[PDB]
Design a protein around this ligand. Structure first.
Ligand SMILES: *[C@@H]1O[C@H](CO)[C@@H](O[C@@H]2O[C@H](CO)[C@@H](O[C@@H]3O[C@H](CO)[C@@H](O)[C@H](O)[C@H]3NC(C)=O)[C@H](O)[C@H]2NC(C)=O)[C@H](O)[C@H]1NC(C)=O
Ligand SMILES: *[C@@H]1O[C@H](CO)[C@@H](O[C@@H]2O[C@H](CO)[C@@H](O[C@@H]3O[C@H](CO)[C@@H](O)[C@H](O)[C@@H]3O)[C@H](O)[C@H]2NC(C)=O)[C@H](O)[C@H]1NC(C)=O
Ligand SMILES: *[C@@H]1O[C@H](CO)[C@@H](O[C@@H]2O[C@H](CO)[C@@H](O[C@@H]3O[C@H](CO)[C@@H](O)[C@H](O)[C@@H]3O)[C@H](O)[C@H]2NC(C)=O)[C@H](O)[C@H]1NC(C)=O
Ligand SMILES: *[C@@H]1O[C@H](CO)[C@@H](O[C@@H]2O[C@H](CO)[C@@H](O[C@@H]3O[C@H](CO)[C@@H](O)[C@H](O)[C@@H]3O)[C@H](O)[C@H]2NC(C)=O)[C@H](O)[C@H]1NC(C)=O
Ligand SMILES: *[C@@H]1O[C@H](CO)[C@@H](O[C@@H]2O[C@H](CO)[C@@H](O[C@@H]3O[C@H](CO)[C@@H](O)[C@H](O)[C@@H]3O)[C@H](O)[C@H]2NC(C)=O)[C@H](O)[C@H]1NC(C)=O
Ligand SMILES: *[C@@H]1O[C@H](CO)[C@@H](O[C@@H]2O[C@H](CO)[C@@H](O[C@@H]3O[C@H](CO)[C@@H](O)[C@H](O)[C@@H]3O)[C@H](O)[C@H]2NC(C)=O)[C@H](O)[C@H]1NC(C)=O
Ligand SMILES: *[C@@H]1O[C@H](CO)[C@@H](O[C@@H]2O[C@H](CO)[C@@H](O[C@@H]3O[C@H](CO)[C@@H](O)[C@H](O)[C@@H]3O)[C@H](O)[C@H]2NC(C)=O)[C@H](O)[C@H]1NC(C)=O
Ligand SMILES: *[C@@H]1O[C@H](CO)[C@@H](O[C@@H]2O[C@H](CO)[C@@H](O)[C@H](O)[C@H]2NC(C)=O)[C@H](O)[C@H]1NC(C)=O
Ligand SMILES: *[C@@H]1O[C@H](CO)[C@@H](O[C@@H]2O[C@H](CO)[C@@H](O)[C@H](O)[C@H]2NC(C)=O)[C@H](O)[C@H]1NC(C)=O
Ligand SMILES: *[C@@H]1O[C@H](CO)[C@@H](O[C@@H]2O[C@H](CO)[C@@H](O)[C@H](O)[C@H]2NC(C)=O)[C@H](O)[C@H]1NC(C)=O
Ligand SMILES: *[C@@H]1O[C@H](CO)[C@@H](O[C@@H]2O[C@H](CO)[C@@H](O)[C@H](O)[C@H]2NC(C)=O)[C@H](O)[C@H]1NC(C)=O
Ligand SMILES: *[C@@H]1O[C@H](CO)[C@@H](O)[C@H](O)[C@H]1NC(C)=O
Ligand SMILES: *[C@@H]1O[C@H](CO)[C@@H](O)[C@H](O)[C@H]1NC(C)=O
Ligand SMILES: *[C@@H]1O[C@H](CO)[C@@H](O)[C@H](O)[C@H]1NC(C)=O
Lengths: 122, 461, 122, 122
């Protein structure tokens, strides 16, 4: 668990499943155990619901059909995927992210309605 | 070459333990939420039960190792505690008693003792002299008595009791157990299935049938009947410590009554709390008793002797009295209507049976009814005192109750001189033995819906 | 529910949905009433998470791209899928089972990273 | 939230996803809070389990390969989808709906085995 947290994103690109493989389920004490199990179930279901909203659920890497805005852009691709680590990169990508989630949601809905309009005449 | 595949929803299972939950029969509980078993809170079983026979399925069963009986024993104990918790306590009542004889002559029963005592009113500084009637098993003569009238309660040197609330009804409402979703209940269908073995006919079910939490010892009452054959269940059949459960094919109807017109009085104890007691007896006192049709009981004992001598060849069976001991252990104890009965049962278990069918007189017409005397206790410490002791409040008017004997709790008195005449006696005391007769059929398993198999089938890429 | 438990795997290939159909629907008593629902939710979410990790989630039959090892292999295909039943087959396949899940997980991760390395340029 | 509850079914095809976005968002009071969280988790998991049973999970709009029966049919396509709203439509499809789901399930199962009848020979 978290066996490659210090590496780069490309180096973690083959090790990203070890996080998710132990996420779910890896009188005072009984109360605490009940609270812990409920919290674990909620925290596992939250991001799965978000991935189901974005439609790219069931896979660990999502291609999005959403253009990267220039206001978010400061670094190059080799500057990120070879020189940078996830934890410190989260600090600078902490901005704009809540807008990005909604953009993914509306783009996914547009993709679904376009696919419905295509397949209704299929 | 070959390729693994995994399948979801495969029909395999495994043995497991899990926490079950109650389910009533959707009875109209809106008036009767004050039942002691709190069965109104259970989820109502609306549709028909999932009577799903499997076919081609054999599995081993062990009802002496079943987890379910211990869970429901703990549930009954916890229900008793949580029902008896908010009721009124009897700590101020434990005082010095002065007692005399209320019954005129010793008669055939005189054990209604009269006693007088002191109580606290609503005001702390106002002591009030009061009187009540009790039973002789309830009261104990005081220590270092000079054969005096000084008396106390039985519990006062052990633990304090609380009286039962008068709204509480002790009717055994049937209770279903259901496994949680993802688990399953497998039950046997083999008609001659004893306690252990492989059941050739196994059916799954979501919820168990309506078993009843009947509080009784030495005689199973209102249980599920044996379908066609009298079943003998014992864990070893050669150790005397293993209690023989006898499951009768046909019920034996038993009537029990207290005949006298008992009256109820009330005594103010403390701030806003009341106590209930026996005030007077109206009319001539008569003996509390039970009535059993003798011919059917004799024929049932004969068939039990047949089923036991086919397990114990060339040995005559002696139906004898139970071993000596306490009142709660020797006597057959139960409750009906809200009062508690202890019945003598000496003449009930008095007979024998050999390989010869001794009694074709059962074919003759007769109206012989055995009648056995019974006594009444107000203070009980049942389940060996693991719960708080309950003071049963007395009930006005007479009490009548009717029941079916469906099962017997027997032990083998393995004496040295039993080379040809074997002795079997009534037994009991462990209340889970009452419930193992009803949970003999069921078993809990866990569904594991993932399977692994090769098919030489390759994923597209 | 479990309407074809004693049958063969080919016969159970039609009724494998009725098992998963009923896996989620159905103060002393209230504690157990809470506990049963919590246990059922956990039990469903466990193997749903496992199917999500293996990538063949959303379908009842998984094509795996993992070769069956010869040490696992003793029977023929017709011996299994026509003669054998699931419940007794689980007993003999209880061996070697623990590494299969990790093999499926690493194969799914390799497939996803190869798909990313393809579609980043394609 | 519920921003097109009074509109037609064509309009709700833009809004519906954000309705799903609110399906999981957020000592007496502690007991009630625990009960609310457990109820929300169960309610979110039930219909997702139904979508996974029908096989069209992971997308908002499902195509079913199940023919619409004539006994259910009284209105035209433009009579439904442009004249009236979801609520009265649910009121009038309160009849006959309780079998339809199961039909989808077995239809889905047939597709899977048909897919197996291709994929064993793939
Ligand atoms: C003790 O055993 C008795 C039999 O030895 C039981 O008595 C039988 O109970 C059945 C169900 O309670 C009765 O069946 C019902 O009969 C009535 C009247 O005929 C019908 O309207 C009902 O439909 C019918 N119900 C069912 C489910 O069959 C029997 O009539 C009745 N008598 C006989 C001779 O069989 C006792 O119920 C049983 N328990 C107790 C507490 O006494
Ligand atoms: C059990 O013993 C008690 C104690 O003696 C009996 O209570 C007594 O009952 C009698 C009549 O039943 C009472 O006599 C009455 O007294 C009142 C005044 O208090 C008077 O007005 C009446 O005319 C009558 O004489 C007596 O007071 C009462 N004593 C006490 C201490 O309560 C009780 O009757 C006995 N029970 C039985 C079944 O014998
Ligand atoms: C609380 O007080 C009761 C009442 O005295 C105690 O019960 C008594 O216990 C003794 C010891 O077992 C019993 O004596 C026995 O009597 C039988 C004959 O009946 C005899 O065969 C035995 O050898 C023994 O002597 C006594 O009968 C019994 N009394 C009653 C009314 O049950 C109890 O022990 C006390 N408990 C505590 C914790 O102090
Ligand atoms: C159920 O009860 C039976 C007894 O019928 C237990 O089976 C074994 O029975 C034999 C004789 O029937 C016992 O052998 C005895 O050994 C002592 C000491 O070695 C010897 O002095 C005797 O003459 C006799 O040969 C044997 O001890 C007994 N087994 C055990 C473990 O005690 C049986 O074990 C009981 N339980 C079950 C689950 O069957
Ligand atoms: C249940 O009822 C039976 C039947 O009455 C009771 O057994 C009887 O107990 C009395 C004691 O009160 C015995 O009386 C005495 O027997 C001795 C020994 O023979 C004798 O020497 C005395 O003079 C006196 O008669 C009686 O024999 C005995 N049996 C019968 C058939 O009456 C039993 O005590 C009751 N209770 C329980 C818990 O079993
Ligand atoms: C009811 O059941 C009882 C016992 O199950 C039956 O009574 C028994 O009847 C036999 C003879 O039919 C008696 O055997 C005799 O015992 C004396 C005792 O000394 C012996 O000397 C004789 O040689 C013979 O073996 C047995 O004692 C007797 N048992 C009792 C407790 O009375 C009875 O026949 C059954 N009645 C019906 C209507 O089913
Ligand atoms: C209080 O005691 C009285 C008198 O013993 C009990 O009354 C008796 O109750 C039984 C059944 O509960 C009656 O038997 C049946 O009576 C009906 C007609 O009422 C008849 O059709 C049946 O074939 C059967 O014989 C019995 O007749 C009746 N006796 C009298 C004199 O009324 C009463 O049940 C007891 N009450 C309580 C609450 O314990
Ligand atoms: C109940 O309390 C009364 C007093 O309220 C007790 O009566 C006293 O008993 C003692 C002991 O024999 C006597 O010396 C007194 O003369 C009695 N009277 C009073 C007014 O104190 C009585 O013993 C207590 N017990 C019972 C069972 O009545
Ligand atoms: C196996 O057990 C099942 C259920 O206990 C039996 O099914 C019942 O059979 C009887 C007649 O034999 C019918 O009257 C019942 O209606 C059946 N039950 C149901 C729920 O329909 C089955 O017969 C048993 N089979 C064997 C070989 O013992
Ligand atoms: C029921 O069991 C009791 C057990 O005590 C038997 O009583 C014994 O009977 C034998 C018979 O020879 C005597 O030697 C003993 O002294 C008796 N013991 C006691 C304590 O009395 C009784 O006989 C048995 N009854 C039947 C019908 O078998
Ligand atoms: C067991 O039953 C037998 C048979 O009824 C009883 O023996 C009779 O007891 C009465 C009672 O005094 C005597 O009048 C008879 O003479 C006895 N008959 C015989 C053949 O002995 C016996 O008392 C019963 N025992 C118990 C404990 O109930
Ligand atoms: C119970 O029955 C099985 C076979 O059905 C048998 O092997 C076993 O010995 C029996 N046990 C008892 C105590 O009758
Ligand atoms: C044992 O009983 C059977 C029938 O009950 C009988 O045939 C057999 O002879 C008896 N044994 C002896 C040694 O008499
Ligand atoms: C069994 O007991 C009865 C009692 O009357 C007797 O007639 C019969 O002979 C006995 N049979 C044997 C085998 O002892």
């Amino acid at each position: 668990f978290l066996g490659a947290a210090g590496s780069t994103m490309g180096a973690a690109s083959m090790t990203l499943t070890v996080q998710a493989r132990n996420l779910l389920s890896g009188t005072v004490w009984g109360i605490k155990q009940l609270q812990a199990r409920v919290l674990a179930v909620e925290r596992y279901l939250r991001d799965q619901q978000l991935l189901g909203i974005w439609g790219c659920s069931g896979k660990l890497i999502c291609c999005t059909n959403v253009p990267w805005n220039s206001s978010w852009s400061n670094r190059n691709l080799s500057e990120i995927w070879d020189n940078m680590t996830w934890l410190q990169w989260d600090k600078e990508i902490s901005n704009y992210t809540q807008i990005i989630y909604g953009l993914l949601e509306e783009s996914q809905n547009q993709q679904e309605k376009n696919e419905q309009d295509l397949l209704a005449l299929d | 070459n070959l390729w693994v595949t995994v399948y979801y929803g495969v029909p395999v299972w495994k043995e497991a333990k899990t926490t079950l939950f109650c389910a009533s029969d959707a009875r109209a509980y809106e008036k009767e939420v004050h039942n002691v078993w709190a069965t109104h809170a259970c989820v109502p079983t609306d549709p028909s039960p999932q009577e799903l026979v499997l076919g081609n399925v054999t599995e081993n069963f062990n009802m002496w190792k079943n987890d379910m009986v211990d869970q429901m024993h703990e549930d009954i104990i916890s229900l008793w505690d949580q029902s008896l918790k908010p009721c009124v306590k009897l700590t101020p009542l434990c005082v010095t008693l002065i007692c005399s004889d209320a019954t005129v002559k010793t008669g055939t029963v005189e054990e209604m003792k009269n006693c007088s005592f002191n109580t606290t009113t609503e005001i702390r500084d106002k002591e009030k002299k009061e009187y009540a009637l009790f039973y002789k098993p309830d009261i104990v003569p005081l220590s270092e008595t000079n054969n005096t009238s000084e008396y106390r309660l039985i519990n006062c040197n052990t633990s304090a009791c609380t009286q039962a609330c008068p709204k509480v009804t002790f009717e055994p409402i049937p209770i279903h157990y259901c496994a949680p979703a993802g688990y399953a209940i497998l039950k046997c269908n083999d008609e001659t299935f004893n306690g252990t073995g492989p059941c050739s006919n196994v059916s799954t079910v979501q919820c168990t049938h309506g078993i009843r939490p009947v509080v009784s010892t030495q005689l199973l009452l209102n249980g599920s009947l044996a379908e066609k054959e009298i079943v003998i269940r014992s864990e070893n059949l050669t150790n005397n410590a293993k209690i023989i459960i006898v499951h009768l094919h046909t019920p034996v109807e038993i009537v029990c009554t207290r005949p006298n017109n008992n009256t109820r009085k009330s005594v103010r104890i403390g701030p806003g709390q009341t106590f209930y007691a026996t005030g007077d007896i109206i009319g001539d006192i008569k003996q509390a008793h039970c009535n059993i049709s003798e011919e059917k009981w004799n024929d049932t004992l004969q068939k039990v002797g047949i089923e036991l001598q086919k397990h114990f060849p060339n040995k005559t069976i002696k139906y004898n009295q139970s071993a000596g001991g306490d009142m709660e252990i020797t006597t057959h104890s139960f409750n009906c209507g809200g009062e508690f009965f202890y019945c003598n049962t000496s003449n009930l278990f008095n007979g024998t049976y050999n390989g010869t069918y001794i009694s074709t007189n059962s074919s003759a017409n007769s109206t012989s009814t055995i009648t056995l005397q019974c006594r009444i206790k107000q203070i009980i410490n049942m389940w060996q005192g693991v719960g708080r002791c309950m003071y049963a409040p007395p009930i006005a008017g007479n009490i009548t109750c009717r029941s079916n004997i469906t099962g017997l709790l027997l032990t083998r008195d393995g004496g040295t001189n039993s080379n040809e005449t074997e002795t079997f006696r009534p037994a009991g005391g462990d209340m889970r033995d009452n419930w193992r007769s009803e949970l003999y059929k069921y078993k809990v398993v866990k569904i594991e819906p993932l399977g692994v198999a090769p098919t030489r089938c390759k994923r597209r890429v």
